Amino acid sequence: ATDTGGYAATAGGNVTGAVSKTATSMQDIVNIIDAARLDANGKKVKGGAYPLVITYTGNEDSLINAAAANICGQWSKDPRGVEIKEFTKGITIIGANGSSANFGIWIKKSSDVVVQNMRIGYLPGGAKDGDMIRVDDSPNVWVDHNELFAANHECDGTPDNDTTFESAVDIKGASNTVTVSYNYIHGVKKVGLDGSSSSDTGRNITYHHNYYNDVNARLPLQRGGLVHAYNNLYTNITGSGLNVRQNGQALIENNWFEKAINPVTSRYDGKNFGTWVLKGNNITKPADFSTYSITWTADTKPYVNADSWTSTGTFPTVAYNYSPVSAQCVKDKLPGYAGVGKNLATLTSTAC
Ligand SMILES: [Ca+2]
């Protein structure tokens, strides 16, 4: 139906009248979307003329491998990405098994977009917003079962010493409902925003069943709104995890944290700290910090860490249906369900 296991409720291009097309390259995707705006008389229709299900069969392993072998050469290149602008008819971009992209997907002022089974990595243009997936002013977006990766590393001499690579999943603007699920995100410094600035507050986002490994920060960097993070596996977090800011509220439930510095915090603003409701994670009390290698650091400005591992606020009744498996099951089974080529498999109690 329109069940994503989170705030976003969409079927994307899988609706009545959907037109199935095969994209063999980045350019095909661009041309296919362009043609999907035309009605029977060749006239443009605002929002798109018909629903789409694009199956990407392209492979850019050569670009990815070359980039991996010389990471510091990526930031200064031109960014590469497909833009889904003002397309509200319903669109699903699914990669075929074995497919890969050295380009991102930038969604803007659209809605009902599903991006699945895409293996995206080592994108050029970190200094010019070379995001892997960007969700801007776009509600009902479901980013599911993808592998987004780069190298958790900052080359020196890059603009703002932060542009070696851009983000995995940046969300900003009026992207009111978004679900980010079953993604394998690794080797990424700035995972993803949830609000581009202090003023860009709001949105209701669900992060579930994601496997993060070797990521520095922003899981997400939340500015206001609501975030529901459940059944995620967070390992090797080298900077900070969920950074709840501008009075945002987060429900952090049944996740597995391990080898993480500041997994749950509120820093960098010095005020308007966000709150969290901790429930059912592998960590239940401070005594578990040493067990799972959780480390905490202070910050130059006033901050709040979850070092007491107690809930600091409340969370509204979650608007959707979902059934979280235990944190232990996440730890044991998630790596086989998250990512590409899993045939979009989901983790159920049964499989625990
Ligand atoms: Ca970005």
Swiss-Prot record:
Disulfide pattern: 72-155, 329-352
Protein name per its UniProtKB record: Pectate lyase C
Cofactor: Ca(2+)
Gene name tied to this protein: pelC
Record: active site: 218
EC number, as in UniProt: 4.2.2.2
Cited SMART domains: Amb_all
Keyword line: Calcium, Disulfide bond, Lyase, Metal-binding, Secreted, Signal, Virulence
